[PDB]
Amino acid sequence: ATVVSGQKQDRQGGERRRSQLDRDQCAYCKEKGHWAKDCPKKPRGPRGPRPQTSLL
RNA sequence: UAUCUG
Ligand SMILES: [Zn+2]
């Protein structure tokens, strides 16, 4: 078998403004001062283990 | 009630 806990959802997403994403803001928490790559909320990356080498 | 799109 294979399951973690029910759940049965999935979505990519489209239309979605990038707010006032400042050149010195965070595109993760939405903070200002640190970058997403420097987001203090980021535990460890990369995130999303998807072995799909077909897109380029 | 699962945020790196810059
Ligand atoms: Zn952040």
What fraction, in percent, of the residue positions are helical? under 10%
Percentage of residues in DSSP E strands: under 5%
Give the CATH superfamily: Zinc finger, CCHC-type
User: What small molecules does the structure contain?
Assistant: zinc ion
Structural class: little secondary structure
Please tell me what the overall shape is: extended
Tally of contiguous helical segments: 0
Terminal CA distance reads 33 Å
CATH architecture assignment: Irregular
Number of domains: 1
CATH topology term: HIV-1 Nucleocapsid Protein
Count the beta strands.
0
Highest-level CATH class: Few Secondary Structures
- Main sheet overview: none
Estimated radius of gyration: 16 Å
Zinc finger (CCHC-type): 24-41
Function: Involved in the packaging and encapsidation of two copies of the genome. Binds with high affinity to conserved UCUG elements within the packaging signal, located near the 5'-end of the genome. This binding is dependent on genome dimerization.
Subcellular location: Virion
Biased composition (Basic and acidic residues): 8-41
